[PDB]
Amino acid sequence: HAPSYRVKRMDIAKNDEECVVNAANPRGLPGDGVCKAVYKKWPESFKNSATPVGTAKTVMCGTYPVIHAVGPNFSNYSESEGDRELAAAYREVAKEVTRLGVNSVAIPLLSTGVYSGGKDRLTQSLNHLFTAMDSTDADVVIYCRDKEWEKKISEAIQMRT
Ligand SMILES: Nc1ncnc2c1ncn2[C@@H]1O[C@H](COP(=O)(O)OP(=O)(O)OC[C@H]2O[C@@H](O)[C@H](O)[C@@H]2O)[C@@H](O)[C@H]1O
């Protein structure tokens, strides 16, 4: 089977993949953005989900893994230190996806919403996603909500091959 990258413009909570990545806070609390949708569907996935910035923590909901990935808040982190934490968060996602042995994963662009510090970070977040997930053989489906972002993510995927 050929491992694939795809992008879907829809609610990541309605994914049809074998596991989901939450854009989490380090305290395992409900939030806005992706975390709002993840908490609405899998609130029991927030049992002991608290984990440091630049890490991922998996909570099983029956047979369904919820991977809580904590991107840096660029309001609090410098561009330099934030870039390292964003790399690290996606690397821990890659490790969790590998460990779980899943065939697919639904993933959002970490630190591009509530944690963006008001900057457009599509290219930054997507490049870190690729850097981490390129060595995995899971089918990766990137979820977004903006039409312009969907075309930009789609173009970025197609342009590599
Ligand atoms: N339900 C959704 N489905 C798909 N994409 C979504 C959804 N909600 C938001 N997005 C988009 O996914 C990206 C991730 O944004 P956030 O969820 O805000 O993530 P992040 O920037 O990492 O901020 C994390 C913080 O947000 C709080 O919700 C959460 O508790 C955490 O502290 C953004 O481009 C955003 O527009």
Author numbering: 1 to 161
Publication passage describing the model:
For this purpose, ADP-ribose was used to optimize the protocol since the high-resolution co-crystal structure of nsP3MD-ADP-ribose was determined prior to the attempt of co-crystallization with a fragment. Native nsP3MD crystals were soaked with ADP-ribose in three different cryo-protectant buffers (cryo-buffers): (i) a cryo-buffer containing glycerol and iso-propanol (26% PEG400, 0.1M sodium citrate, pH5.6, 10% 2-propanol, 25% glycerol), (ii) a cryo-buffer containing glycerol but no isopropanol (26% PEG400, 0.1M sodium citrate, pH 5.6, 25% glycerol), and (iii) a cryo-buffer without glycerol and iso-propanol (42% PEG400, 0.1M sodium citrate, pH5.6). The crystals were directly frozen in the liquid nitrogen for X-ray diffraction data collection. Three structures of nsP3MD-ADP-ribose were determined and found to be very stable after overnight soaking in all three cryo-buffers. The electron density of ADP-ribose was clearly observed in all three structures. In the structure, residues D10, G32, V33 and R144 are responsible for the specific recognition of adenine nucleobase. The T111 provides a hydrogen bond with the adenine proximal ribose. The main chain NH groups of residues S110, G112, and Y114 are involved in the phosphate binding via hydrogen bonds. Residues Y114, D31 and N24 make hydrogen bonds with the OH group on the distal ribose. Notably, most residue contacts with ADP-ribose are highly conserved within the alphavirus family.
The nsP3 has a highly conserved macrodomain across species at the N-terminus, a central zinc-binding domain, and a C-terminal hypervariable domain (HVD). Recent work has demonstrated that CHIKV nsP3 macrodomain (nsP3MD) possesses mono(ADP-ribose) (MAR) hydrolase activity, which specifically removes the MAR moiety from aspartate and glutamate residues but not from lysine residues in substrate proteins. Mutants affecting MAR hydrolase activity and ADP-ribose binding slow viral replication in mammalian cells and reduce CHIKV virulence in mice. These results suggest that the nsP3 macrodomain is critical for CHIKV replication and may be a pharmaceutical target for anti-CHIKV drug discovery.
